[PDB]
Amino acid sequence: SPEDFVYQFKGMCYFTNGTERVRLVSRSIYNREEIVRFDSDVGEFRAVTLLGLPAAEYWNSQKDILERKRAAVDRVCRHNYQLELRTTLQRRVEPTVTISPSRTNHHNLLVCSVTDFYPAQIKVRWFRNDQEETAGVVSTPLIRNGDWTFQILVMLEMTPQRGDVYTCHVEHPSLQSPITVEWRAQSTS
Amino acid sequence: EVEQDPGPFNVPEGATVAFNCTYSNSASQSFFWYRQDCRKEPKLLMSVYSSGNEDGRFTAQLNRASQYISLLIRDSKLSDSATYLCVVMGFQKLVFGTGTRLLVSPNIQNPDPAVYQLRDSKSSDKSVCLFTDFDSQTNVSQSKDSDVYITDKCVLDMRSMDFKSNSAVAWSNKSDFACANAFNNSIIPEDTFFP
Amino acid sequence: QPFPQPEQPF
Amino acid sequence: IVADHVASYGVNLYQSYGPSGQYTHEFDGDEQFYVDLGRKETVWCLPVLRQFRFDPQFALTNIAVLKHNLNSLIKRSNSTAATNEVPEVTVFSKSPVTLGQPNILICLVDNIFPPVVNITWLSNGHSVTEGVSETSFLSKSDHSFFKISYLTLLPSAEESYDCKVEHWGLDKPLLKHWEP
Amino acid sequence: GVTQTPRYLIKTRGQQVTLSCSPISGHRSVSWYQQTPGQGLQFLFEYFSETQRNKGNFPGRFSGRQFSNSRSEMNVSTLELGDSALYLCASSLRAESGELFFGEGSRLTVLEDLNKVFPPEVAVFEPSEAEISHTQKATLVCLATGFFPDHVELSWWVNGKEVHSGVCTDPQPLKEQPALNDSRYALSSRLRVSATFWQNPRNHFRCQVQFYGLSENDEWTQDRAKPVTQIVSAEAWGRA
Ligand SMILES: *[C@@H]1O[C@H](CO)[C@@H](O)[C@H](O)[C@H]1NC(C)=O
Ligand SMILES: *[C@@H]1O[C@H](CO)[C@@H](O)[C@H](O)[C@H]1NC(C)=O
């Protein structure tokens, strides 16, 4: 197996409550060991391991490097957030909501597929005859498709009575009002 | 882990003092000496560098090869009496050493060791004994009778007179007690004068 | 223009 | 670190084995763009971002600094090389399967390190090239990577697929199968 | 610099306490440290941007918080005898700094019982004529006795003005019963002046002991006066 030597540099920005809290963390990484860090809360380079000590001391001795890094939370993070506000943070893709019955016979499982939505924040609930079901609900984790959409499968273990209406109920920032999709038991299982 | 000179430094005024401190974590990034007077708060004294930070009578230096930190106090003054803390900063941990205590004693030029007796201003009869004007080599030993109280040595500095003196105080509620024998529990001088 | 974060040389 | 939003402006990668590098920006875990270092071209992955400008010369300069810095650290680590992690592979569809309706197969290759991987789509043993695309080496907080490959298709009862993943952390090629 | 309140405090086992720290203006990081004989400085918790950034090894009855003006509070919900200590806060401009500016600390004494608390008795002892003859200098002595706990500040005042030249105060009190941990204390101090300066009877010499004892909120059911925070002094004038 060929040997490989890897370097990573990550200029990371953290935002909370709009730009009320903004934090820059610059990370230099050898293979998977973070070795040097610039955290705007700290205001100087810090050696995370011994391998990063010479770089941290050397960069901290360079006044021009320090003041650029210290301004970078505004110059980079806050500047780019204004662009995100007009683009990524405005991205609304409404979820597609689909119910299909399954087994694990007669049907004893319903799968609510909630697909192709953005952003990630979502609330999916199962109702049976207008009463929220809590037991018997199993969800996949939030699934990242990689194309700026997510999906999630929320499953309900069920023993259906003929006439029962099972409702998948989805809340999402793209929606003025929840999506509800109904599955109506046509027989008793 | 931060390890310091593990003992009180008793130093005559004017001597040069060397403090040493070692750290075990090679990744340790920054280094400081703090100064702390008895029962008070620590105060940043200086940052430490490989070149040697120098500031008046104080020099601090770092050796990363040996993982040593040092502080030098030239021409020590009575006011340098404090506990000197080695402080070592690594990734998300700032470690204060336990400190090295430094006690700077005065150079008593013309010792006049005496034991006076002093009377209460407001009240009467109540008296204390003052052992004073001895040289700095003299130790003063606390009593081992629960009736007799002996304080430690104490240096005062009459600044406008450039005069410094050691003293200690003894007192007792007991009628037996007299200033002639108050300090016979501590090496006292044959020169010591008893009016 | 997105503004980015430059790495420093050792 | 807990935050409402996390961005990488950007993710800089350089590795000896190519030698190859990668420059991307990420927002909340998704790829905003990569700079094709060979062509000196900024390639946007979200269409609304195309209104913006990013000088690919910045990416080239940054990666050049990574190259320099990497050599120093190979020397100082005593040529301490990357450990080959075992990647995890999952195949799934973008939307629910309707035989005969356009869909997309998604092959997620997670826990990639080092960032060198082959991802190929198989159908009835033949390699599929048409309708295939993939993301960049997307960063993770433990500094491994993931990568996602896409196969557009019409699902049919008689046609099945494998995602084939080759990585130095694997004993044999890993085939991950999908059937409608 | 850094402001800490209360500067002295007596509590009993099981009680709660809140200490306050105002950092140097502009500083955003506040740290709390506990200082005891024999462990030195122990880190409690660091507070930056109104959240706890780092935490030491203390149990959860020790908690803290930081407000939006960067003022910080420390709380102990249930006090133990071993929590008696100097609680120090330190501020720095940025987080995780090795360069710290400490307040003067909150001296917290935790007792089983407040019946042990006494203010000092203070007496001044006038210079000996033998000293005045033999040295041409005059030593006044001050005795503060019988106080508990060791919450005292002794100062000398000459003609209304506090003096330090010629003064030495014992750095450590003597225990009047050295076996008891709740032993009452004694403290001595000397003020030396020129024989001439003392021989002037216009000159006024005061020894002043600030005692920090019980607060208004503390209950008191003993017969003796409630041993509150108070100043006890003795004075002397000088004779021909
Ligand atoms: C963000 O702001 C909200 C006020 O709407 C507040 O409840 C919350 O505590 C804030 N969070 C942080 C991390 O400041
Ligand atoms: C990817 O495929 C090429 C040729 O098909 C091969 O030479 C290379 O080693 C493969 N990479 C890995 C990581 O297996």
Side-chain angles (χ1 to χ4, degrees), chain E residues 101-115 117-118:
Chain E
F101 298 71
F102 283 86
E104 293 189 89
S106 291
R107 192 165 292 288
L108 173 62
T109 294
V110 186
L111 306 175
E112 188 58 49
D113 178 20
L114 300 182
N115 305 323
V117 181
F118 296 84

mmCIF file with all atom_site columns, all heavy atoms in Angstrom, chain E residues 101-118, unseen atoms left out:
data_model
loop_
_atom_site.group_PDB
_atom_site.id
_atom_site.type_symbol
_atom_site.label_atom_id
_atom_site.label_alt_id
_atom_site.label_comp_id
_atom_site.label_asym_id
_atom_site.label_entity_id
_atom_site.label_seq_id
_atom_site.pdbx_PDB_ins_code
_atom_site.Cartn_x
_atom_site.Cartn_y
_atom_site.Cartn_z
_atom_site.occupancy
_atom_site.B_iso_or_equiv
_atom_site.pdbx_formal_charge
_atom_site.auth_seq_id
_atom_site.auth_comp_id
_atom_site.auth_asym_id
_atom_site.auth_atom_id
_atom_site.pdbx_PDB_model_num
ATOM 1   N N   . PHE E 1 101 ? -4.713  39.229 35.312 1.00 0.00 ? 101 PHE E N   1
ATOM 2   C CA  . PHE E 1 101 ? -4.758  40.306 36.288 1.00 0.00 ? 101 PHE E CA  1
ATOM 3   C C   . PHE E 1 101 ? -5.737  39.901 37.377 1.00 0.00 ? 101 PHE E C   1
ATOM 4   O O   . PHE E 1 101 ? -6.942  39.806 37.123 1.00 0.00 ? 101 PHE E O   1
ATOM 5   C CB  . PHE E 1 101 ? -5.165  41.624 35.631 1.00 0.00 ? 101 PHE E CB  1
ATOM 6   C CG  . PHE E 1 101 ? -4.201  42.101 34.583 1.00 0.00 ? 101 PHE E CG  1
ATOM 7   C CD1 . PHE E 1 101 ? -4.101  41.452 33.361 1.00 0.00 ? 101 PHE E CD1 1
ATOM 8   C CD2 . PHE E 1 101 ? -3.398  43.204 34.816 1.00 0.00 ? 101 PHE E CD2 1
ATOM 9   C CE1 . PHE E 1 101 ? -3.215  41.886 32.394 1.00 0.00 ? 101 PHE E CE1 1
ATOM 10  C CE2 . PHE E 1 101 ? -2.510  43.648 33.849 1.00 0.00 ? 101 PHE E CE2 1
ATOM 11  C CZ  . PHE E 1 101 ? -2.417  42.986 32.637 1.00 0.00 ? 101 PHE E CZ  1
ATOM 12  N N   . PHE E 1 102 ? -5.216  39.645 38.573 1.00 0.00 ? 102 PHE E N   1
ATOM 13  C CA  . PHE E 1 102 ? -5.994  39.100 39.672 1.00 0.00 ? 102 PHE E CA  1
ATOM 14  C C   . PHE E 1 102 ? -6.590  40.216 40.513 1.00 0.00 ? 102 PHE E C   1
ATOM 15  O O   . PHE E 1 102 ? -5.938  41.235 40.761 1.00 0.00 ? 102 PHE E O   1
ATOM 16  C CB  . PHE E 1 102 ? -5.124  38.212 40.563 1.00 0.00 ? 102 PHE E CB  1
ATOM 17  C CG  . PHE E 1 102 ? -4.845  36.855 39.986 1.00 0.00 ? 102 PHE E CG  1
ATOM 18  C CD1 . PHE E 1 102 ? -3.789  36.656 39.112 1.00 0.00 ? 102 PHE E CD1 1
ATOM 19  C CD2 . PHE E 1 102 ? -5.626  35.768 40.341 1.00 0.00 ? 102 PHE E CD2 1
ATOM 20  C CE1 . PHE E 1 102 ? -3.526  35.405 38.594 1.00 0.00 ? 102 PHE E CE1 1
ATOM 21  C CE2 . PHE E 1 102 ? -5.368  34.512 39.829 1.00 0.00 ? 102 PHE E CE2 1
ATOM 22  C CZ  . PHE E 1 102 ? -4.318  34.330 38.951 1.00 0.00 ? 102 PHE E CZ  1
ATOM 23  N N   . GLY E 1 103 ? -7.828  40.014 40.954 1.00 0.00 ? 103 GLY E N   1
ATOM 24  C CA  . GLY E 1 103 ? -8.376  40.802 42.032 1.00 0.00 ? 103 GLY E CA  1
ATOM 25  C C   . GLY E 1 103 ? -7.691  40.446 43.338 1.00 0.00 ? 103 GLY E C   1
ATOM 26  O O   . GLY E 1 103 ? -6.789  39.612 43.399 1.00 0.00 ? 103 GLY E O   1
ATOM 27  N N   . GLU E 1 104 ? -8.122  41.105 44.410 1.00 0.00 ? 104 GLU E N   1
ATOM 28  C CA  . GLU E 1 104 ? -7.539  40.841 45.718 1.00 0.00 ? 104 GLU E CA  1
ATOM 29  C C   . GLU E 1 104 ? -8.155  39.639 46.414 1.00 0.00 ? 104 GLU E C   1
ATOM 30  O O   . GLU E 1 104 ? -7.642  39.213 47.451 1.00 0.00 ? 104 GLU E O   1
ATOM 31  C CB  . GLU E 1 104 ? -7.663  42.074 46.609 1.00 0.00 ? 104 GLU E CB  1
ATOM 32  C CG  . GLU E 1 104 ? -6.820  43.233 46.122 1.00 0.00 ? 104 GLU E CG  1
ATOM 33  C CD  . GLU E 1 104 ? -6.764  44.371 47.110 1.00 0.00 ? 104 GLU E CD  1
ATOM 34  O OE1 . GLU E 1 104 ? -5.864  44.361 47.973 1.00 0.00 ? 104 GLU E OE1 1
ATOM 35  O OE2 . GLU E 1 104 ? -7.621  45.273 47.027 1.00 0.00 ? 104 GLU E OE2 1
ATOM 36  N N   . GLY E 1 105 ? -9.232  39.084 45.880 1.00 0.00 ? 105 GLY E N   1
ATOM 37  C CA  . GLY E 1 105 ? -9.766  37.829 46.362 1.00 0.00 ? 105 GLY E CA  1
ATOM 38  C C   . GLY E 1 105 ? -10.911 38.013 47.346 1.00 0.00 ? 105 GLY E C   1
ATOM 39  O O   . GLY E 1 105 ? -11.078 39.060 47.974 1.00 0.00 ? 105 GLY E O   1
ATOM 40  N N   . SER E 1 106 ? -11.715 36.964 47.474 1.00 0.00 ? 106 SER E N   1
ATOM 41  C CA  . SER E 1 106 ? -12.734 36.871 48.508 1.00 0.00 ? 106 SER E CA  1
ATOM 42  C C   . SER E 1 106 ? -12.251 35.856 49.535 1.00 0.00 ? 106 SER E C   1
ATOM 43  O O   . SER E 1 106 ? -12.092 34.673 49.213 1.00 0.00 ? 106 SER E O   1
ATOM 44  C CB  . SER E 1 106 ? -14.088 36.460 47.925 1.00 0.00 ? 106 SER E CB  1
ATOM 45  O OG  . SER E 1 106 ? -14.644 37.491 47.123 1.00 0.00 ? 106 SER E OG  1
ATOM 46  N N   . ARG E 1 107 ? -11.984 36.319 50.754 1.00 0.00 ? 107 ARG E N   1
ATOM 47  C CA  . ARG E 1 107 ? -11.540 35.439 51.830 1.00 0.00 ? 107 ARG E CA  1
ATOM 48  C C   . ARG E 1 107 ? -12.777 34.838 52.485 1.00 0.00 ? 107 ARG E C   1
ATOM 49  O O   . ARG E 1 107 ? -13.506 35.531 53.202 1.00 0.00 ? 107 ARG E O   1
ATOM 50  C CB  . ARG E 1 107 ? -10.689 36.197 52.844 1.00 0.00 ? 107 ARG E CB  1
ATOM 51  C CG  . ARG E 1 107 ? -9.964  35.302 53.826 1.00 0.00 ? 107 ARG E CG  1
ATOM 52  C CD  . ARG E 1 107 ? -8.859  36.044 54.567 1.00 0.00 ? 107 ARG E CD  1
ATOM 53  N NE  . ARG E 1 107 ? -7.749  36.423 53.699 1.00 0.00 ? 107 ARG E NE  1
ATOM 54  C CZ  . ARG E 1 107 ? -6.868  35.572 53.189 1.00 0.00 ? 107 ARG E CZ  1
ATOM 55  N NH1 . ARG E 1 107 ? -6.972  34.268 53.386 1.00 0.00 ? 107 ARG E NH1 1
ATOM 56  N NH2 . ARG E 1 107 ? -5.858  36.042 52.462 1.00 0.00 ? 107 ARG E NH2 1
ATOM 57  N N   . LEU E 1 108 ? -13.025 33.559 52.225 1.00 0.00 ? 108 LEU E N   1
ATOM 58  C CA  . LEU E 1 108 ? -14.203 32.863 52.728 1.00 0.00 ? 108 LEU E CA  1
ATOM 59  C C   . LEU E 1 108 ? -13.783 31.911 53.840 1.00 0.00 ? 108 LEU E C   1
ATOM 60  O O   . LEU E 1 108 ? -12.950 31.025 53.620 1.00 0.00 ? 108 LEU E O   1
ATOM 61  C CB  . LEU E 1 108 ? -14.910 32.103 51.602 1.00 0.00 ? 108 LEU E CB  1
ATOM 62  C CG  . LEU E 1 108 ? -16.067 31.173 51.977 1.00 0.00 ? 108 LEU E CG  1
ATOM 63  C CD1 . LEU E 1 108 ? -17.196 31.962 52.619 1.00 0.00 ? 108 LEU E CD1 1
ATOM 64  C CD2 . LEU E 1 108 ? -16.562 30.411 50.755 1.00 0.00 ? 108 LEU E CD2 1
ATOM 65  N N   . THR E 1 109 ? -14.357 32.090 55.027 1.00 0.00 ? 109 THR E N   1
ATOM 66  C CA  . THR E 1 109 ? -14.170 31.166 56.136 1.00 0.00 ? 109 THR E CA  1
ATOM 67  C C   . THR E 1 109 ? -15.483 30.441 56.403 1.00 0.00 ? 109 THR E C   1
ATOM 68  O O   . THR E 1 109 ? -16.522 31.081 56.594 1.00 0.00 ? 109 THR E O   1
ATOM 69  C CB  . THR E 1 109 ? -13.695 31.892 57.398 1.00 0.00 ? 109 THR E CB  1
ATOM 70  O OG1 . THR E 1 109 ? -12.384 32.431 57.183 1.00 0.00 ? 109 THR E OG1 1
ATOM 71  C CG2 . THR E 1 109 ? -13.633 30.928 58.566 1.00 0.00 ? 109 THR E CG2 1
ATOM 72  N N   . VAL E 1 110 ? -15.438 29.111 56.398 1.00 0.00 ? 110 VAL E N   1
ATOM 73  C CA  . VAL E 1 110 ? -16.613 28.275 56.619 1.00 0.00 ? 110 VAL E CA  1
ATOM 74  C C   . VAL E 1 110 ? -16.478 27.624 57.988 1.00 0.00 ? 110 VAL E C   1
ATOM 75  O O   . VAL E 1 110 ? -15.489 26.934 58.264 1.00 0.00 ? 110 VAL E O   1
ATOM 76  C CB  . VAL E 1 110 ? -16.779 27.213 55.517 1.00 0.00 ? 110 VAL E CB  1
ATOM 77  C CG1 . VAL E 1 110 ? -18.085 26.463 55.681 1.00 0.00 ? 110 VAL E CG1 1
ATOM 78  C CG2 . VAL E 1 110 ? -16.696 27.854 54.139 1.00 0.00 ? 110 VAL E CG2 1
ATOM 79  N N   . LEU E 1 111 ? -17.467 27.854 58.843 1.00 0.00 ? 111 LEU E N   1
ATOM 80  C CA  . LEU E 1 111 ? -17.456 27.361 60.207 1.00 0.00 ? 111 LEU E CA  1
ATOM 81  C C   . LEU E 1 111 ? -18.632 26.422 60.417 1.00 0.00 ? 111 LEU E C   1
ATOM 82  O O   . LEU E 1 111 ? -19.626 26.465 59.692 1.00 0.00 ? 111 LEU E O   1
ATOM 83  C CB  . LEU E 1 111 ? -17.526 28.518 61.211 1.00 0.00 ? 111 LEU E CB  1
ATOM 84  C CG  . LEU E 1 111 ? -16.452 29.584 61.025 1.00 0.00 ? 111 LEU E CG  1
ATOM 85  C CD1 . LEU E 1 111 ? -16.682 30.746 61.973 1.00 0.00 ? 111 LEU E CD1 1
ATOM 86  C CD2 . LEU E 1 111 ? -15.077 28.975 61.238 1.00 0.00 ? 111 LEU E CD2 1
ATOM 87  N N   . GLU E 1 112 ? -18.505 25.550 61.412 1.00 0.00 ? 112 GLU E N   1
ATOM 88  C CA  . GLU E 1 112 ? -19.664 24.768 61.818 1.00 0.00 ? 112 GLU E CA  1
ATOM 89  C C   . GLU E 1 112 ? -20.676 25.641 62.547 1.00 0.00 ? 112 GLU E C   1
ATOM 90  O O   . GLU E 1 112 ? -21.880 25.356 62.529 1.00 0.00 ? 112 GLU E O   1
ATOM 91  C CB  . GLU E 1 112 ? -19.218 23.600 62.699 1.00 0.00 ? 112 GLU E CB  1
ATOM 92  C CG  . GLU E 1 112 ? -20.322 22.610 63.021 1.00 0.00 ? 112 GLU E CG  1
ATOM 93  C CD  . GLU E 1 112 ? -20.950 22.015 61.778 1.00 0.00 ? 112 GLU E CD  1
ATOM 94  O OE1 . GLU E 1 112 ? -20.207 21.548 60.890 1.00 0.00 ? 112 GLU E OE1 1
ATOM 95  O OE2 . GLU E 1 112 ? -22.194 22.015 61.691 1.00 0.00 ? 112 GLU E OE2 1
ATOM 96  N N   . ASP E 1 113 ? -20.208 26.739 63.132 1.00 0.00 ? 113 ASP E N   1
ATOM 97  C CA  . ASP E 1 113 ? -20.925 27.429 64.189 1.00 0.00 ? 113 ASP E CA  1
ATOM 98  C C   . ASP E 1 113 ? -20.359 28.837 64.297 1.00 0.00 ? 113 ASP E C   1
ATOM 99  O O   . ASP E 1 113 ? -19.147 29.028 64.193 1.00 0.00 ? 113 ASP E O   1
ATOM 100 C CB  . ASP E 1 113 ? -20.762 26.660 65.508 1.00 0.00 ? 113 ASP E CB  1
ATOM 101 C CG  . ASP E 1 113 ? -21.447 27.330 66.677 1.00 0.00 ? 113 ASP E CG  1
ATOM 102 O OD1 . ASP E 1 113 ? -22.351 28.162 66.456 1.00 0.00 ? 113 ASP E OD1 1
ATOM 103 O OD2 . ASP E 1 113 ? -21.087 27.009 67.830 1.00 0.00 ? 113 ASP E OD2 1
ATOM 104 N N   . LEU E 1 114 ? -21.235 29.818 64.495 1.00 0.00 ? 114 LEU E N   1
ATOM 105 C CA  . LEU E 1 114 ? -20.810 31.207 64.589 1.00 0.00 ? 114 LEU E CA  1
ATOM 106 C C   . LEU E 1 114 ? -20.499 31.630 66.017 1.00 0.00 ? 114 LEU E C   1
ATOM 107 O O   . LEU E 1 114 ? -20.019 32.748 66.226 1.00 0.00 ? 114 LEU E O   1
ATOM 108 C CB  . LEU E 1 114 ? -21.882 32.129 63.994 1.00 0.00 ? 114 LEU E CB  1
ATOM 109 C CG  . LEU E 1 114 ? -22.225 31.902 62.517 1.00 0.00 ? 114 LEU E CG  1
ATOM 110 C CD1 . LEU E 1 114 ? -23.273 32.899 62.018 1.00 0.00 ? 114 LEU E CD1 1
ATOM 111 C CD2 . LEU E 1 114 ? -20.970 31.962 61.656 1.00 0.00 ? 114 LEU E CD2 1
ATOM 112 N N   . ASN E 1 115 ? -20.758 30.761 66.998 1.00 0.00 ? 115 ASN E N   1
ATOM 113 C CA  . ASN E 1 115 ? -20.371 31.037 68.376 1.00 0.00 ? 115 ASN E CA  1
ATOM 114 C C   . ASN E 1 115 ? -18.864 31.206 68.533 1.00 0.00 ? 115 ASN E C   1
ATOM 115 O O   . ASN E 1 115 ? -18.418 31.729 69.557 1.00 0.00 ? 115 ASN E O   1
ATOM 116 C CB  . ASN E 1 115 ? -20.847 29.912 69.306 1.00 0.00 ? 115 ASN E CB  1
ATOM 117 C CG  . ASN E 1 115 ? -22.335 29.645 69.202 1.00 0.00 ? 115 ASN E CG  1
ATOM 118 O OD1 . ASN E 1 115 ? -23.134 30.562 69.032 1.00 0.00 ? 115 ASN E OD1 1
ATOM 119 N ND2 . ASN E 1 115 ? -22.716 28.372 69.301 1.00 0.00 ? 115 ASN E ND2 1
ATOM 120 N N   . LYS E 1 116 ? -18.070 30.773 67.555 1.00 0.00 ? 116 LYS E N   1
ATOM 121 C CA  . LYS E 1 116 ? -16.615 30.848 67.650 1.00 0.00 ? 116 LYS E CA  1
ATOM 122 C C   . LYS E 1 116 ? -16.055 32.210 67.267 1.00 0.00 ? 116 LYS E C   1
ATOM 123 O O   . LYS E 1 116 ? -14.846 32.434 67.407 1.00 0.00 ? 116 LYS E O   1
ATOM 124 C CB  . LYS E 1 116 ? -15.983 29.790 66.750 1.00 0.00 ? 116 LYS E CB  1
ATOM 125 N N   . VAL E 1 117 ? -16.898 33.124 66.819 1.00 0.00 ? 117 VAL E N   1
ATOM 126 C CA  . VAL E 1 117 ? -16.447 34.352 66.183 1.00 0.00 ? 117 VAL E CA  1
ATOM 127 C C   . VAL E 1 117 ? -16.349 35.454 67.230 1.00 0.00 ? 117 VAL E C   1
ATOM 128 O O   . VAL E 1 117 ? -17.317 35.729 67.948 1.00 0.00 ? 117 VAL E O   1
ATOM 129 C CB  . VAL E 1 117 ? -17.392 34.749 65.038 1.00 0.00 ? 117 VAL E CB  1
ATOM 130 C CG1 . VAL E 1 117 ? -16.916 36.027 64.362 1.00 0.00 ? 117 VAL E CG1 1
ATOM 131 C CG2 . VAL E 1 117 ? -17.499 33.620 64.032 1.00 0.00 ? 117 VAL E CG2 1
ATOM 132 N N   . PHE E 1 118 ? -15.173 36.084 67.315 1.00 0.00 ? 118 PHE E N   1
ATOM 133 C CA  . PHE E 1 118 ? -14.881 37.178 68.244 1.00 0.00 ? 118 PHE E CA  1
ATOM 134 C C   . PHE E 1 118 ? -14.083 38.266 67.538 1.00 0.00 ? 118 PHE E C   1
ATOM 135 O O   . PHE E 1 118 ? -13.135 37.957 66.800 1.00 0.00 ? 118 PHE E O   1
ATOM 136 C CB  . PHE E 1 118 ? -14.064 36.720 69.460 1.00 0.00 ? 118 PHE E CB  1
ATOM 137 C CG  . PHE E 1 118 ? -14.757 35.740 70.343 1.00 0.00 ? 118 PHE E CG  1
ATOM 138 C CD1 . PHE E 1 118 ? -14.743 34.389 70.045 1.00 0.00 ? 118 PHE E CD1 1
ATOM 139 C CD2 . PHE E 1 118 ? -15.386 36.162 71.499 1.00 0.00 ? 118 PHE E CD2 1
ATOM 140 C CE1 . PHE E 1 118 ? -15.368 33.477 70.875 1.00 0.00 ? 118 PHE E CE1 1
ATOM 141 C CE2 . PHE E 1 118 ? -16.012 35.259 72.330 1.00 0.00 ? 118 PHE E CE2 1
ATOM 142 C CZ  . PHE E 1 118 ? -16.002 33.914 72.020 1.00 0.00 ? 118 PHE E CZ  1
#
